[PDB]
């Protein structure tokens, strides 16, 4: 209703201001402030960049929720949709890259450099483009019934392609990346078992454990924020459509929840990363 969507939009504004502030801070700290351009932090920079873009979309989506239609036209319609998908894919792919980096650090403790991680970020945005660009072409703001709206157009017959795109996007933007991550940390367990102050100098081992913890928590927070949406959107692809005030409300709030993940990221760095913790204040 009117007041409940006022809640949604106010939530967006909060996530928008705090998220842009935090992620811009992080990007600044890594970029110029210090030669702390480590592999993990270059990947973190990638995350903050994607968060920045989607955060920039939050005000526009907010007005759409209020008015009940899209009053910004096709250009910004395709721009927004593109950013959204780019966000999901670059996020999961970057998290996977961080997890593989951690695993290599444990297996080969005795050659990871910012230049290679920068290259990985490039490849991440290229694959993301494989889905980001087509959706931008497909997405449009059209007046199907009663009102104009921004939507991604599913080809005819929708009953076939809907499930196709639903299952494929579900697997490849979510299940498979998370799956790889699971393999990485499980293998790290097998290797780590029975090792105390092993495969390193004392001081370094402690730092490695701290970074591994950080990556793990970031993954956990992300998966926790986007799993409800992922399941619901999958169900929507299969034809399962919400048709009650409560159903719509639940959906709106779970979508919001994922956007909250965008702003959550700098706080996690501030509490679980010593360098960042020093840099805030
Ligand atoms: O409903 C909107 N935005 C909600 C976007 C939700 N987004 C939809 C795609 C979701 C996604 C993605 Cl991009 C990738 C993999 C899995 C999943 Cl579930 C992630 C959540 C309305 C508000 C203004 C125009 N329109 C934006 C829109 C953004 C992306 C796709 C379709 C519409
Ligand atoms: C997605 C691409 C993931 C492959 C990149 C490996 C990351 C390990 C590293 O270079 O530190």
């Amino acid at each position: 209703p009117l007041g409940l969507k006022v809640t949604i939009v106010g939530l967006y504004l909060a996530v928008c201001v705090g998220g842009l502030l935090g992620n811009c801070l992080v990007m600044y700290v890594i970029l110029r402030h210090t030669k702390m351009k480590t592999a993990t932090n270059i990947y973190i920079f990638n995350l903050a960049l994607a968060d920045t873009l989607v955060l920039l979309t939050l005000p526009f989506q907010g007005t759409d929720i209020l008015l009940g239609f899209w009053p910004f036209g096709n250009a910004l319609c395709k721009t927004v949709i593109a950013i959204d998908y780019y966000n999901m894919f670059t996020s999961t792919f970057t998290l996977t890259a961080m997890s593989v980096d951690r695993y290599v650090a444990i297996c080969h403790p005795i050659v990871r450099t910012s230049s290679k991680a920068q290259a990985v970020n490039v490849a991440i945005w290229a694959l993301a483009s494989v889905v980001g660009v087509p959706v931008a072409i497909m997405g449009s703001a059209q007046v199907e019934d009663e009102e104009i709206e921004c939507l991604v157009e599913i080809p005819t017959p929708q009953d076939y392609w809907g499930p196709v795109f639903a299952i494929c996007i579900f697997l490849f933007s979510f299940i498979v990346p998370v799956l790889v991550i699971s393999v990485c940390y499980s293998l790290m367990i097998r290797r780590l078992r029975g090792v105390r102050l092993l495969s390193g100098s004392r001081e370094k081992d402690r730092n490695l454990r701290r970074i591994t913890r950080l990556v793990l928590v970031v993954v956990a927070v992300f998966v926790g924020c986007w799993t409800p949406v992922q399941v619901f959107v999958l169900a929507q692809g299969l034809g399962v459509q919400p048709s009650s005030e409560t159903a719509v409300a639940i959906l709106r709030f779970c979508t919001a929840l994922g956007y909250v993940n965008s702003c959550l990221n700098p706080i996690l760095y501030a509490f679980l990363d010593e360098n960042f913790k020093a840099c805030f204040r």
Side-chain angles (χ1 to χ4, degrees), residues 50 53-54 79-93 124-134 136:
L53 273 52
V54 67
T79 302
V80 164
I81 303 184
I83 282 179
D84 194 41
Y85 285 75
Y86 264 109
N87 171 43
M88 200 62 51
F89 284 84
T90 57
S91 295
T92 55
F93 290 160
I124 290 177
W125 281 96
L127 267 166
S129 295
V130 173
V131 180
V133 180

Short mmCIF file of all heavy atoms in Angstrom, two decimals, residues 50 53-54 79-93 124-134 136:
data_model
loop_
_atom_site.label_atom_id
_atom_site.label_comp_id
_atom_site.label_asym_id
_atom_site.label_seq_id
_atom_site.Cartn_x
_atom_site.Cartn_y
_atom_site.Cartn_z
N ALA A 50 30.68 -2.46 -8.62
CA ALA A 50 29.35 -2.94 -8.97
C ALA A 50 28.30 -2.41 -8.01
O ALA A 50 27.23 -1.94 -8.43
CB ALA A 50 29.34 -4.47 -9.00
N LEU A 53 27.28 1.18 -8.87
CA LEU A 53 26.35 1.31 -9.99
C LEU A 53 24.92 1.02 -9.58
O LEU A 53 24.01 1.83 -9.79
CB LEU A 53 26.77 0.40 -11.15
CG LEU A 53 27.79 0.91 -12.18
CD1 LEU A 53 29.05 1.47 -11.53
CD2 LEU A 53 28.13 -0.19 -13.17
N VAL A 54 24.68 -0.15 -8.97
CA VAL A 54 23.31 -0.53 -8.62
C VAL A 54 22.74 0.44 -7.60
O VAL A 54 21.56 0.81 -7.67
CB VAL A 54 23.26 -1.99 -8.14
CG1 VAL A 54 23.99 -2.18 -6.81
CG2 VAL A 54 21.82 -2.46 -8.05
N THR A 79 19.25 0.81 -19.29
CA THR A 79 20.42 1.06 -18.45
C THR A 79 20.28 0.38 -17.10
O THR A 79 21.18 -0.33 -16.63
CB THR A 79 20.63 2.56 -18.28
OG1 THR A 79 20.78 3.18 -19.56
CG2 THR A 79 21.87 2.84 -17.43
N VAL A 80 19.13 0.59 -16.46
CA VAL A 80 18.86 0.04 -15.13
C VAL A 80 18.90 -1.48 -15.15
O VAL A 80 19.60 -2.12 -14.35
CB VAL A 80 17.51 0.56 -14.61
CG1 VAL A 80 17.02 -0.28 -13.46
CG2 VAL A 80 17.65 2.01 -14.20
N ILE A 81 18.16 -2.09 -16.07
CA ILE A 81 18.11 -3.55 -16.16
C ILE A 81 19.51 -4.11 -16.35
O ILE A 81 19.92 -5.06 -15.68
CB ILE A 81 17.17 -3.98 -17.30
CG1 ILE A 81 15.77 -3.41 -17.11
CG2 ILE A 81 17.09 -5.48 -17.35
CD1 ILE A 81 14.78 -3.88 -18.16
N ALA A 82 20.28 -3.50 -17.26
CA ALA A 82 21.64 -3.95 -17.51
C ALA A 82 22.48 -3.93 -16.23
O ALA A 82 23.14 -4.92 -15.90
CB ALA A 82 22.29 -3.07 -18.58
N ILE A 83 22.43 -2.82 -15.49
CA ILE A 83 23.21 -2.71 -14.26
C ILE A 83 22.83 -3.82 -13.29
O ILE A 83 23.69 -4.47 -12.69
CB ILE A 83 23.02 -1.32 -13.63
CG1 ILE A 83 23.86 -0.26 -14.35
CG2 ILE A 83 23.37 -1.35 -12.14
CD1 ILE A 83 23.68 1.14 -13.77
N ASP A 84 21.52 -4.05 -13.14
CA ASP A 84 21.05 -5.05 -12.18
C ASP A 84 21.66 -6.42 -12.46
O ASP A 84 22.21 -7.05 -11.55
CB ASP A 84 19.52 -5.12 -12.23
CG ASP A 84 18.95 -5.86 -11.05
OD1 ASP A 84 19.44 -5.66 -9.92
OD2 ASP A 84 18.03 -6.68 -11.25
N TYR A 85 21.57 -6.89 -13.70
CA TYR A 85 22.13 -8.19 -14.04
C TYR A 85 23.64 -8.18 -13.93
O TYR A 85 24.24 -9.14 -13.42
CB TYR A 85 21.69 -8.62 -15.44
CG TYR A 85 20.25 -9.07 -15.49
CD1 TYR A 85 19.21 -8.16 -15.45
CD2 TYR A 85 19.93 -10.42 -15.57
CE1 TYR A 85 17.89 -8.57 -15.50
CE2 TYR A 85 18.61 -10.84 -15.61
CZ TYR A 85 17.60 -9.91 -15.58
OH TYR A 85 16.29 -10.32 -15.62
N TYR A 86 24.28 -7.11 -14.39
CA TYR A 86 25.72 -6.98 -14.24
C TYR A 86 26.12 -7.12 -12.78
O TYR A 86 27.10 -7.80 -12.45
CB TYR A 86 26.18 -5.63 -14.78
CG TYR A 86 26.68 -5.66 -16.21
CD1 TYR A 86 25.94 -5.08 -17.23
CD2 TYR A 86 27.88 -6.27 -16.53
CE1 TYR A 86 26.38 -5.10 -18.53
CE2 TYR A 86 28.34 -6.29 -17.84
CZ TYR A 86 27.58 -5.70 -18.83
OH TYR A 86 28.01 -5.71 -20.13
N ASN A 87 25.35 -6.51 -11.88
CA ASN A 87 25.61 -6.60 -10.45
C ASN A 87 25.64 -8.05 -9.98
O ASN A 87 26.62 -8.50 -9.38
CB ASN A 87 24.54 -5.81 -9.69
CG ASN A 87 24.60 -6.03 -8.20
OD1 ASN A 87 25.68 -6.06 -7.60
ND2 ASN A 87 23.44 -6.20 -7.58
N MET A 88 24.58 -8.80 -10.26
CA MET A 88 24.49 -10.18 -9.80
C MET A 88 25.66 -11.02 -10.30
O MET A 88 26.30 -11.74 -9.53
CB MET A 88 23.16 -10.80 -10.24
CG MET A 88 22.74 -12.03 -9.44
SD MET A 88 22.46 -11.69 -7.69
CE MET A 88 21.35 -10.28 -7.81
N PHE A 89 25.94 -10.93 -11.60
CA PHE A 89 26.97 -11.79 -12.19
C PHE A 89 28.37 -11.38 -11.74
O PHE A 89 29.17 -12.24 -11.35
CB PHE A 89 26.87 -11.76 -13.72
CG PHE A 89 25.73 -12.58 -14.27
CD1 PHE A 89 24.45 -12.05 -14.36
CD2 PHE A 89 25.94 -13.87 -14.71
CE1 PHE A 89 23.41 -12.80 -14.88
CE2 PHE A 89 24.91 -14.63 -15.23
CZ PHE A 89 23.64 -14.09 -15.31
N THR A 90 28.69 -10.09 -11.81
CA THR A 90 30.02 -9.66 -11.38
C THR A 90 30.24 -9.96 -9.90
O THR A 90 31.35 -10.33 -9.50
CB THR A 90 30.23 -8.17 -11.65
OG1 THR A 90 29.20 -7.42 -10.99
CG2 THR A 90 30.21 -7.89 -13.14
N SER A 91 29.20 -9.82 -9.08
CA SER A 91 29.31 -10.14 -7.66
C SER A 91 29.71 -11.60 -7.46
O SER A 91 30.76 -11.89 -6.87
CB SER A 91 27.99 -9.84 -6.95
OG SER A 91 27.70 -8.45 -6.99
N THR A 92 28.89 -12.53 -7.96
CA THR A 92 29.16 -13.94 -7.73
C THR A 92 30.50 -14.37 -8.33
O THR A 92 31.26 -15.11 -7.70
CB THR A 92 28.03 -14.80 -8.31
OG1 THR A 92 27.84 -14.48 -9.69
CG2 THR A 92 26.73 -14.53 -7.54
N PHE A 93 30.80 -13.89 -9.54
CA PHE A 93 32.06 -14.27 -10.18
C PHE A 93 33.26 -13.72 -9.41
O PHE A 93 34.28 -14.40 -9.27
CB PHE A 93 32.08 -13.79 -11.63
CG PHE A 93 31.13 -14.54 -12.52
CD1 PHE A 93 30.71 -13.99 -13.72
CD2 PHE A 93 30.64 -15.78 -12.16
CE1 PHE A 93 29.83 -14.66 -14.55
CE2 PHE A 93 29.75 -16.46 -12.99
CZ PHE A 93 29.35 -15.90 -14.18
N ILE A 124 35.92 -11.08 -15.65
CA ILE A 124 34.63 -11.15 -14.96
C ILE A 124 33.61 -10.27 -15.65
O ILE A 124 32.47 -10.69 -15.90
CB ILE A 124 34.81 -10.76 -13.48
CG1 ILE A 124 35.58 -11.85 -12.73
CG2 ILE A 124 33.47 -10.46 -12.83
CD1 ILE A 124 35.87 -11.51 -11.30
N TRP A 125 34.00 -9.04 -15.99
CA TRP A 125 33.07 -8.14 -16.65
C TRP A 125 32.75 -8.59 -18.07
O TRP A 125 31.68 -8.27 -18.60
CB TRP A 125 33.64 -6.72 -16.65
CG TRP A 125 33.47 -6.00 -15.34
CD1 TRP A 125 34.38 -5.90 -14.33
CD2 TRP A 125 32.31 -5.29 -14.90
NE1 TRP A 125 33.86 -5.17 -13.29
CE2 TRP A 125 32.59 -4.78 -13.62
CE3 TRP A 125 31.06 -5.03 -15.47
CZ2 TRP A 125 31.66 -4.03 -12.89
CZ3 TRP A 125 30.14 -4.29 -14.75
CH2 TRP A 125 30.45 -3.80 -13.48
N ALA A 126 33.66 -9.35 -18.69
CA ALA A 126 33.41 -9.84 -20.04
C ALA A 126 32.32 -10.91 -20.03
O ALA A 126 31.37 -10.85 -20.82
CB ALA A 126 34.71 -10.39 -20.63
N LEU A 127 32.45 -11.90 -19.15
CA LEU A 127 31.40 -12.91 -19.00
C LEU A 127 30.08 -12.28 -18.57
O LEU A 127 29.03 -12.61 -19.11
CB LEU A 127 31.83 -13.96 -17.97
CG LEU A 127 32.54 -15.22 -18.46
CD1 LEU A 127 33.17 -15.93 -17.28
CD2 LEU A 127 31.55 -16.14 -19.17
N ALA A 128 30.13 -11.39 -17.57
CA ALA A 128 28.93 -10.65 -17.18
C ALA A 128 28.27 -10.02 -18.39
O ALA A 128 27.04 -10.03 -18.53
CB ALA A 128 29.29 -9.58 -16.14
N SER A 129 29.08 -9.46 -19.30
CA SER A 129 28.54 -8.85 -20.51
C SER A 129 27.76 -9.86 -21.34
O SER A 129 26.77 -9.50 -21.99
CB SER A 129 29.67 -8.22 -21.32
OG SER A 129 30.27 -7.14 -20.62
N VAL A 130 28.19 -11.13 -21.34
CA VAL A 130 27.48 -12.16 -22.09
C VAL A 130 26.00 -12.19 -21.74
O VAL A 130 25.16 -12.51 -22.58
CB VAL A 130 28.15 -13.54 -21.88
CG1 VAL A 130 27.34 -14.64 -22.52
CG2 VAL A 130 29.54 -13.53 -22.49
N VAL A 131 25.65 -11.80 -20.51
CA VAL A 131 24.25 -11.74 -20.13
C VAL A 131 23.78 -10.29 -20.03
O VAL A 131 22.61 -9.98 -20.31
CB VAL A 131 24.01 -12.52 -18.82
CG1 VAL A 131 22.54 -12.47 -18.41
CG2 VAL A 131 24.44 -13.98 -18.97
N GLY A 132 24.69 -9.38 -19.67
CA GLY A 132 24.27 -8.00 -19.44
C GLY A 132 23.80 -7.28 -20.69
O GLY A 132 22.78 -6.59 -20.67
N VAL A 133 24.53 -7.45 -21.79
CA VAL A 133 24.23 -6.77 -23.05
C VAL A 133 22.96 -7.34 -23.68
O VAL A 133 22.09 -6.55 -24.07
CB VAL A 133 25.42 -6.87 -24.02
CG1 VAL A 133 25.10 -6.17 -25.33
CG2 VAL A 133 26.68 -6.29 -23.40
N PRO A 134 22.79 -8.66 -23.80
CA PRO A 134 21.54 -9.16 -24.41
C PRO A 134 20.30 -8.72 -23.68
O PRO A 134 19.30 -8.36 -24.31
CB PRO A 134 21.72 -10.69 -24.36
CG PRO A 134 23.16 -10.89 -24.37
CD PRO A 134 23.72 -9.77 -23.53
N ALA A 136 19.90 -6.02 -21.95
CA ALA A 136 19.68 -4.61 -22.26
C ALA A 136 18.93 -4.45 -23.57
O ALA A 136 18.02 -3.62 -23.69
CB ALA A 136 21.01 -3.86 -22.30
#
